[PDB]
Ligand binder design. Sequence first.
Ligand code: HEM
Ligand SMILES: C=C1C[C@@]23CC[C@H]4[C@@](C)(CCC[C@@]4(C)C(=O)O)[C@@H]2CC[C@@H]1C3
Length: 418
Amino acid sequence: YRDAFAALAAPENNSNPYEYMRWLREHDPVHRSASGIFLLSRHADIYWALKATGDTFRGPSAGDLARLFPRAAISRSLNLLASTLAMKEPPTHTRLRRLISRDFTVRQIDSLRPSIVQVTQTRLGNIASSLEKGHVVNLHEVFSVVLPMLIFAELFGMTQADIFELAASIRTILEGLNPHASDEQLAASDAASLEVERYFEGLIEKKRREPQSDLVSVLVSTHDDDDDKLSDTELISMLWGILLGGFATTAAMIDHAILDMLAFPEQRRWLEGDAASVKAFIEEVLRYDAPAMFSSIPRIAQYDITIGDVTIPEGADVRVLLASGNRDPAAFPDPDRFDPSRFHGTAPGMSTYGHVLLSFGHGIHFCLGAQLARVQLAECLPVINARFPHLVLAGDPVREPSAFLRTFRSLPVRLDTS
Ligand code: HEM
Ligand SMILES: C=C1C[C@@]23CC[C@H]4[C@@](C)(CCC[C@@]4(C)C(=O)O)[C@@H]2CC[C@@H]1C3
């Protein structure tokens, strides 16, 4: 193909991109795309680049943005991205993360468990009704996206109406946030972000009118109290960005977890065990299918960086192929074997041999929602396993095409009565 970004976006590799990634890792581990964007596919390089973000790598400066992203000036989505905390280093990053971190702590995620349980039981009850009638159910549409959408809305300060009203817009924006995005895709993303901006403009007034115990209300109060703690552009970027991160990747992990259950029935037993056993299954789900193969966030080299025979020049945009690092045999031996024991009894995300899964990133931009995602999976997956021992696929799952995300359009299932 033209470059690795073209290969990953190609239909031929949409079903199982990991053979291409194995090819890339083995033949061009420090890949230089046609546009000059680099892509690291080895776990060791990826881990280094993530951990070294702060000095060796930084988010784009104003100069970098104009140089590397000449459209950013006429792209609503790129300009919104430029002011998210994922593009920043301390002290700016510290200030912005400090404003949102409380809502995502272990303690605050615990407070969401009653809602997670109630949504899980409510939706699975309706789903069990249809399945028992012999119906085919699109589990992605009626559960996988529904649970994280509703839980995120409660945390964030959105009504259930708003989040369903924007799911379509959110997914079109997401697809525009990658180098290979077509002019058509980026235009639609820009239009959808103005819509999202329109919604938040209204939501902002509502939460200024009636503050409540949600994230949007605290950001607005922090901004309204003092926009040098959170500027106008930082506020809208934060609202936009957290919405983009708030459920799509979590739903993808629920989808992939269900497929793992069906594909590896001998490993479903892990979901019947104690908390540590359930968590271990979910960590292996996260290693096996990172929902973002690489991250939309650019990392700009602050030095000329020589890696083996390849030199990344100062100022170059470097991306990290998280999904390839997760299946890099140097970090995870026999990497295509699905085995929850890799993460059983260890620190979250850490293998028994001391190698981290990369699906949540690492370093200063380590995923803020990691506990939120893990806990939703930990609550719902054992209930799904116990309720449908005879779940089977009813046709092939339909993936949503994308250059970098691993989401689904459908996960059709039925009950096997035999
Ligand atoms: C399975 C689910 C999820 C996955 C796989 C995932 C993935 C990631 C990745 C790879 C990064 C690092 C990006 C980079 O360093 O270039 C990240 C950061 C982040 N994620 Fe998650 N995410 C998930 C769920 C969530 C949720 C539910 C939220 C809710 C708000 C969220 C919010 C964020 C934020 C705000 C950051 C930026 C943190 C910072 O820059 O300090 N994510 N995520
Ligand atoms: C506030 C924010 C939430 C954030 C988390 C990470 C997430 C994005 C970048 C959207 C695309 C997928 C993913 C996983 C990525 O890193 O590619 C999202 C939007 C902007 C920033 C970073």
